[PDB]
Amino acid sequence: TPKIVEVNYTWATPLSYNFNPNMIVYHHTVDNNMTPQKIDEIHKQRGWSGIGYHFYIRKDGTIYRGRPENAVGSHAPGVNARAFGIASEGNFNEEYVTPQQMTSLIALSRYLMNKYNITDLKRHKDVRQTECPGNNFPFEEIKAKLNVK
Ligand SMILES: [Zn+2]
């Protein structure tokens, strides 16, 4: 089972648990050097309860929990009730996922896919107009390693 680091959050507004995931959406953070706590602060400024992603993967491969696994997130308006959101630290218009981020992306994705019977993997740019998760985000390689077509 991948190592998920639990984080102490204080949620500003009520979380909804009317969450029925059938999709994983991949994100980049654009900004580097952010703790999950810093993301949570920014997401609170934007009027969300707190960190909008269900998971945040830092450059050294550490997987932090964001939103509770059974709560609706704030990462992709229009699919939030049906999508896990997985963020990777970086701006992948300008750099590449680290090998440790790739290892964690595959492990976390397969965990969620098996646990929830999910086969639908999407980039944020596949569901909304955005450059996220960045030009160099290795989407086709992730799908290939997970045997998704
Ligand atoms: Zn995004």
Numbering used by the authors: 24 to 172
What does the paper say about this structure?
The two endolysins under study in our laboratory, Ts2631 and Ph2119, which originate from T. scotoductus bacteriophages, reveal structural features characteristic for type 2 amidases (family: PF01510), with a Zn2+ ion coordinated by two histidines and a cysteine residue. Both these proteins show amino acid sequence and structure similarity to numerous enzymes from mesophilic bacteria, including the LysC lytic enzyme of C. intestinale URNW. In the present work, we determined the crystal structures of Ph2119 endolysin and LysC, both to 1.2 Å resolution. The overall structures of Ph2119 endolysin and LysC show conserved catalytic domain architecture, including the Zn2+ coordination site.
The basic local alignment search tool (BLASTP) sequence-similarity searches for proteins showing homology to eukaryotic peptidoglycan recognition proteins (PGRPs) and thermostable Ph2119 and Ts2631 endolysins allowed to identify in the genome of Clostridium intestinale URNW (accession no APJA01000012.1) an open reading frame (ORF, coordinates 584335-584853 nt) encoding a 172 aa protein (Mr = 20,090; pI = 9.96) with a putative lytic function. Genomic localization of the lysC gene (coordinates 584335–584853 nt), separated by more than 68 kb from the nearest annotated phage gene, indicates that it probably encodes a bacterial autolysin involved in peptidoglycan remodeling rather than a phage lytic enzyme. The Ph2119 endolysin, in turn, was used as a model in molecular replacement to determine the structure of LysC. The overall RMSD is 0.81 Å, comparing 85 aligned Cα atoms. Unlike Ph2119 endolysin, LysC has a large part of the N-terminus not present in the electron density maps (23 amino acids in LysC not visible). Most probably these residues could not be traced due to high mobility-intrinsic disorder. The catalytic site of LysC is composed of His50, His147, and Cys155, a motif also present in Ts2631 and Ph2119 endolysins. Other conserved residues, such as His51, Thr52 (HHT motif), Tyr76 (IGYH motif), and Thr153 (T(X)CPG motif) are close to each other in the potential peptidoglycan binding site and may therefore contribute to the catalytic function. The phosphate group was modeled in two adjacent positions in Ph2119 endolysin as well as in the LysC structure, with occupancies of 0.8 and 0.2. Crystallographic and site-directed mutagenesis studies reveal that the highly positively charged N-terminal region of the protein is the major contributor to the antimicrobial activity of LysC.
